[PDB]
Amino acid sequence: DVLSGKYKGPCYFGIIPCFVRGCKPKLFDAHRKLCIKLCKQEGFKSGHCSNFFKFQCWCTR
């Protein structure tokens, strides 16, 4: 388990403008679907929010 594949942001409940299936409805609802889609593009498969230091996103092979 390491800090994502390239880079990530805060947990909250959805905020980005267009990136995956939630572009037309806006706000992803939970950071677990945005954390897995950015790290799985380089070489990963399991992403989640539970660290509380200064980012709240973790990905594992």
Total structural domains in the chain?
1
* 39: phi then psi, degrees, rounded to nearest 5: -75, -40
Output the CA angle 59-14-34, nearest 5 degrees: 25
* 55: phi then psi, degrees, rounded to nearest 5: -155, -35
Distances in Å between the alpha carbon of 10 and those of 6, 30, 34, 35, 57?
A: 15, 11, 11, 10, 8
Q: How was this structure determined?
A: NMR
User: Side-chain half-sphere of 2: how many Cα atoms within 13 Å?
Assistant: 10
6 closest CA partner among 28, 33, 37, 29: 37
| Side chain identity at residue 50, one-letter code | S
Q: Residues for the chain: how many in total?
A: 61
Its domain, for residue 15, covers 1-61
